């Protein structure tokens, strides 16, 4: 089938954006068992499928919002004693969109941010409207650390899964019931299957590695069946399932998903010349003489 593609596109998931790679390059990704697949797509099912309002709130939980988006102004304040970069935080945008953020939540997020603000020097003032990060202990601490913090303070993710970036809400066209399912482009299946309102029982992914880590090997067998048989009927190219029921069942029968690369052959085969006739003929012959 991979030989016979006419290389047509028209595979954007119907949202007219975020086209999924779907040809022999997708078949290569499923077979290679790459932990990183380009175009990772968790399709999620909402607990309430008829409310745009419910969908908007859930999308806010899944997607990542940076501090600068929610911060009205950001000023490095130099004072006769103590220079502190104090971020002014809007309280209307926090209310305008239903994001549950507070100065105490932001203060927790500012720490554990890789900005070295791990000490408790960061402080909360007023009513969720001002957070003050004073400075850092070392590494050009003077006004230098401050210059780095001011540029890197807006990037900190106040709320939402860091990994997911581009959640989109898709509406079904069925006349009797109009239903909304949010397709998220990202990789943390565990988190995106727990955020309140995403029904974990029906959330799925297109990365066998993410599924194998979160849902056993047997669900990782069924995605290797599905995501090959999904990308094979997408390109025309009909195929028996009994071929894919064999390729998946070979690929995951020794414990973990063993992708068919040079590396997965070593964990599948015992004999040397079958490995030695494949790639890395030098190392595989010396190591089996050792």
């Amino acid at each position: 089938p991979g030989t016979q593609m006419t290389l047509k596109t028209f595979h954007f998931a119907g949202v007219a954006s975020m086209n999924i790679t779907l040809g022999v390059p997708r078949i290569k990704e499923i077979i290679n068992a790459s932990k990183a697949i380009s175009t990772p797509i968790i399709t999620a099912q909402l607990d309430k499928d008829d409310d745009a309002d419910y969908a908007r709130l859930v999308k806010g939980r899944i997607e990542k919002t940076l501090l600068g988006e929610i911060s009205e102004y950001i000023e490095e304040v130099f004072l006769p004693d103590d220079c502190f970069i104090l971020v002014k935080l809007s309280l209307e945008r926090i209310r305008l969109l239903r994001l549950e953020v507070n100065a105490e939540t932001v203060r927790y997020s500012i720490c554990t941010s890789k900005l070295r603000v791990k000490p408790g020097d960061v402080a909360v003032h007023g009513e969720a409207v001002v957070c003050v990060t004073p400075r850092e202990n070392s590494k050009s601490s003077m006004y230098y650390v401050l210059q780095f913090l001011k540029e890197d303070l807006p990037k900190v993710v106040v709320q939402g899964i860091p990994e997911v970036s581009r959640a989109v809400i898709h509406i079904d066209e069925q006349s009797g019931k109009e239903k909304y399912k949010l397709l998220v482009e990202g990789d943390n299946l565990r988190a995106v299957m727990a955020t309140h309102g995403v029904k974990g029982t029906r959330t799925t992914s297109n990365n066998t590695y993410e599924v194998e880590k979160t849902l056993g090997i047997e669900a990782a067998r069924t995605t290797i069946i599905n995501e090959i048989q999904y990308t094979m009927v997408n390109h025309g190219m009909s195929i028996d399932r009994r071929h894919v029921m064999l390729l998946s069942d070979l690929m995951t029968y020794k414990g973990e998903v063993l992708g068919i690369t040079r590396f997965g052959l070593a964990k599948m085969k015992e004999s040397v010349l079958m490995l030695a006739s494949f790639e890395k003929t030098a190392d595989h012959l010396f190591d089996a003489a050792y």
């Binding site: 050009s140 230098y144 210059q147 780095f148 540029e151």
Partner: protein, 694 residues
């Protein structure tokens, strides 16, 4: 103007077709060889300070082969193909060596034999009527542009490379936008790169063991003071802020003066030669030698003054930073950024290395025999060997391997055997372009058809297979430019109001109105009014005061105006439309045919102009007279010239699906048909001839 078609035959009598090969070798044999000899003129011996070996004038003579000790008779191209000889001419040079203690001047000493391309100025065939060709046994309808080396006709294929002297902003594998200008001069060709590997700017070069933080380079150059460096790069908040991490790196180290930065750069210079180098070049001195001839060589220090190198370095840093923000990296597929190199350039690079190897070998011989063998005088002329130069070129043409280690140039496939399957196969091979990236298997890269190729490269003529887009073919009306002097363009620009860059602090370069003037990659100043320099320079070119092939282009997004007389740039002729009316005027078109005017008269009367891809970006060409608008600037001379030699032979190409046209171009070359009027006399390895061609 029914006879707007008549201009394609007239441009073609003088230029176009296979000429782009011939006029190129002609420049190498008549102008470039002397520039290379002045650059490597003078060989001096360590053993005797007084000994000197300068070269005064180099000439390349008529092709002749001597079959006896001293006959030196003339030779013909057909005889060389039959007897498997090489068609070549002697390279004769004039020298004034020291000799015993005098200054003996020798006129006309042979240093070797140069391969000669057929139909070149030095070739016997040039200027011969068809009857004269029959005695020489050469077909009159022969493309030329090929070398007979060891009895095999060999063609050097045109090679497409990114333009030299111009900074290229390009993402690294990490997504880290960097920059790289290849400085090609008549002395040294080197690559200088800039990189942001940890959020801080480092300069990289092959003579430096480690990447040097840029602020240290600025201080070594002489722009001591952080404010002057920041003012030069940018005064916008974003540009200054992003160059802030890079300022600390020098501050953390103690470099604060020129000497403390020059010494730091010296402790990093690779000092590979420790033998035969005598004693000299302290670490500080070695740095002042590198910063002045090795880093960004195209920009020239006047008297160890880097005012010019420092501004150019700032322009590179600013371009990385604006690009890093929006990720607007320059496309390396745009034909404006790519210059095609034909035979002259490839031969000149090969000769440059062989002349330096011949000179070096003569110094090594002199150093060994002058201080030891005898009081008897050492005469270089006796020890000089013709073989090093002759053998070197011939081998490179005979086997297509351009292994020049001095320039780190290791390219194979430069030359191919001319295909004599048919007349079309030979003509197509002359107009053949080889890509730089050849291992690329990404579909949307060099392999794709780029809109910039319009009018320059044939859209449908490409081999189907391993090289679907890697090999391209020139269209009918295309001229690849040759290098020009640049003395006039520098003068017109100063008088046209371009203020010098030495007289201004860098703050100006970030004002919105100031724009920078670049000539072949060196800054000529800053002008407030872009439109007057551009519309005055074009008016001057049309009157013929400035050369026709010089091109003025303006980029508004990066405030710079670029004037290019570099050479290797594709140029196509276009009719000029002023006020919705084409300038040909019908009567002029009749005059061409009658004989009063030739194509050159149209160019200097303002009727026709040559536009390169960069200039086309600033123009609004209209294919047909009916499509003329108010905004339209030019008119295409003939639409069918967009296709190439192979593509043209197809009847009604526009009425067919495009893949079918591509197949025909390949098949036409493989067809069996008449090769030449001398086909019967030729004794080639394989010849296929149709008995009754129609």
């Amino acid at each position: 103007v029914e006879e707007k078609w008549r201009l394609l035959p007239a441009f073609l009598k003088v230029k176009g077709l296979v000429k782009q090969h011939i006029d190129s070798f002609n420049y190498f044999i008549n102008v470039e060889i002397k520039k290379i000899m002045k650059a490597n003129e003078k060989v001096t011996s360590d053993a005797d300070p007084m000994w000197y070996l300068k070269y005064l004038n180099i000439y390349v003579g008529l092709p002749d082969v001597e079959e006896s000790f001293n006959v030196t008779r003339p030779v013909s191209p057909h005889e060389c193909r039959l007897r498997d000889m090489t068609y070549s001419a002697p390279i004769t040079v004039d020298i004034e060596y020291t000799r015993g203690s005098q200054r003996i001047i020798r006129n006309a000493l042979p240093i070797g034999r140069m391969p000669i391309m057929l139909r070149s100025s030095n070739c016997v065939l040039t200027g011969k009527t068809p009857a004269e060709f029959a005695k020489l046994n050469e077909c009159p309808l022969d493309p030329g542009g090929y070398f007979i080396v060891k009895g095999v006709e060999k063609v050097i294929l045109i090679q497409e490379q990114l333009s030299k002297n111009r900074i290229i902003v390009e993402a690294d594998r990490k997504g880290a936008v960097g920059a790289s200008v290849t400085s090609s001069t008549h002395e040294k060709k080197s690559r200088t790169n800039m990189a942001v590997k940890q959020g801080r700017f480092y300069l990289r070069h092959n003579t430096l063991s480690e990447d040097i933080p840029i602020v240290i380079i600025f201080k070594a150059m002489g722009v001591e003071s952080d404010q002057e460096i920041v003012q030069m790069i940018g005064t916008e908040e974003h540009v200054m802020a992003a160059f802030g991490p890079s300022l600390e790196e020098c501050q953390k180290a103690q470099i604060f003066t020129q000497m403390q930065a020059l010494k730091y750069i010296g402790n990093k210079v690779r000092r590979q030669r420790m033998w035969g180098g005598g004693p000299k070049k302290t670490k500080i001195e070695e740095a002042r030698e590198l910063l002045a001839s090795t880093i960004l060589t195209h920009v020239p220090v006047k008297e160890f003054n880097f005012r010019a190198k420092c501004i150019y370095t700032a322009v590179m840093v600013r371009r990385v930073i604006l690009a890093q923000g929006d990720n607007k990296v320059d496309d390396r597929d745009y034909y404006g950024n790519k210059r095609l190199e034909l035979a002259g350039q490839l031969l000149s690079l090969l000769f440059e290395d062989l002349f330096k190897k011949f000179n070096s070998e003569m110094k090594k011989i002199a150093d060994q025999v002058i201080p030891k063998q005898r009081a008897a005088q050492f005469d270089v002329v006796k020890h000089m060997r013709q073989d090093q130069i002759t053998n070197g070129m011939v081998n490179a043409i005979s086997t297509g391997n351009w292994s020049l280690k001095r320039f780190k140039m290791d390219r194979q496939g430069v030359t191919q055997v001319l295909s004599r399957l048919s007349y079309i196969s030979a003509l197509g091979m002359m107009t053949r372009i080889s890509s730089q990236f050849e291992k690329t298997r990404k579909v949307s890269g060099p392999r794709s058809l780029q809109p910039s190729q319009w009018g320059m490269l044939c859209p449908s003529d490409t081999p189907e297979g391993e090289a679907c887009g890697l090999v391209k073919n020139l269209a009918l009306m295309t001229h690849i430019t040759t290098d020009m002097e640049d003395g006039p363009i520098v003068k017109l620009a100063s008088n046209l109001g371009v203020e010098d860059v030495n007289l201004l602090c860098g703050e100006e370069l970030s004002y919105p109105n100031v724009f920078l003037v670049f000539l072949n990659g060196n800054i000529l100043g800053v002008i407030r009014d872009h439109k007057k320099l551009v519309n005055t320079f074009r008016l001057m070119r049309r009157a013929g005061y400035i050369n026709e092939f010089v091109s003025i282009s303006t980029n508004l997004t990066d405030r710079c105006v670029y004037i290019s007389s570099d050479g290797g740039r594709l140029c196509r002729p276009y009719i000029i439309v002023k006020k919705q009316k084409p300038a040909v005027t019908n009567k002029h078109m009749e005059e061409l045919a009658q004989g009063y005017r030739n194509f050159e008269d149209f160019l200097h009367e303002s009727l026709v102009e040559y536009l390169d891809v960069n200039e086309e970006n600033d123009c609004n060409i209209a294919l047909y007279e009916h499509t003329i608008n108010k905004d339209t600037t030019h008119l295409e001379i003939e639409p069918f010239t967009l296709l190439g030699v192979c593509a043209g032979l197809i009847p009604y190409p526009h009425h067919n699906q495009s893949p079918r046209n591509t197949y025909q171009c390949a098949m036409g070359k493989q067809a069996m048909g008449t090769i030449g009027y001398n086909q019967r006399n030729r004794i080639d390895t394989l010849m296929y001839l149709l008995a009754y061609p129609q």
